[PDB]
């Protein structure tokens, strides 16, 4: 549950170069596939189990 965004999956460190304003990424199915952690500001990838 990331700042209200809920789901299930495996979290890993991401190589995605988010700009400071960007909080999350999305795929073509309108599913979040990456988030910024609200406390550490680290970018995480989200993949299904």
């Amino acid at each position: 549950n990331f700042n209200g965004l809920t789901g299930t999956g495996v979290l890993t460190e991401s190589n995605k170069k988010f700009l400071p304003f960007q909080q999350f990424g999305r795929d073509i199915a309108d599913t979040t596939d990456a988030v910024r952690d609200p406390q550490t500001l680290e970018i995480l990838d989200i993949t299904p189990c």
Partner: protein, 98 residues
């Protein structure tokens, strides 16, 4: 040897099959972004916001739309599959006779 090496459109018949199938799948996935009249296209948003009675209404809307999308996909694949089978039957005949 030389013609195939200098003609970008030479294998259009095979590329068209690849393109048609890719397009159908991309369309199917993109339909998951549709609301179909629901408050959200995201099932997790609905479940995190509403209790089961109100949630069942919103979910039913997504089920209806998503089932229709999948049925459309499958029907198109069956029709396309028949066309490919006819082509394969012709190819098999040419293998035998040519």
């Amino acid at each position: 040897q030389d013609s195939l090496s200098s003609t970008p459109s030479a294998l259009g018949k095979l590329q068209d099959v690849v393109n048609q199938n890719a397009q159908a799948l991309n369309t199917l996935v993109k339909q998951l972004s549709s609301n179909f009249g629901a408050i959200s296209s995201v099932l997790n948003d609905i479940l995190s916001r509403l209790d089961p009675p109100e949630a069942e209404v919103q979910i039913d809307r997504l089920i209806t739309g998503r089932l229709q999308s999948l049925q459309t996909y499958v029907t198109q694949q069956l029709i396309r599959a028949a066309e490919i089978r006819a082509s394969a039957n012709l190819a098999a005949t040419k293998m035998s006779e040519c």
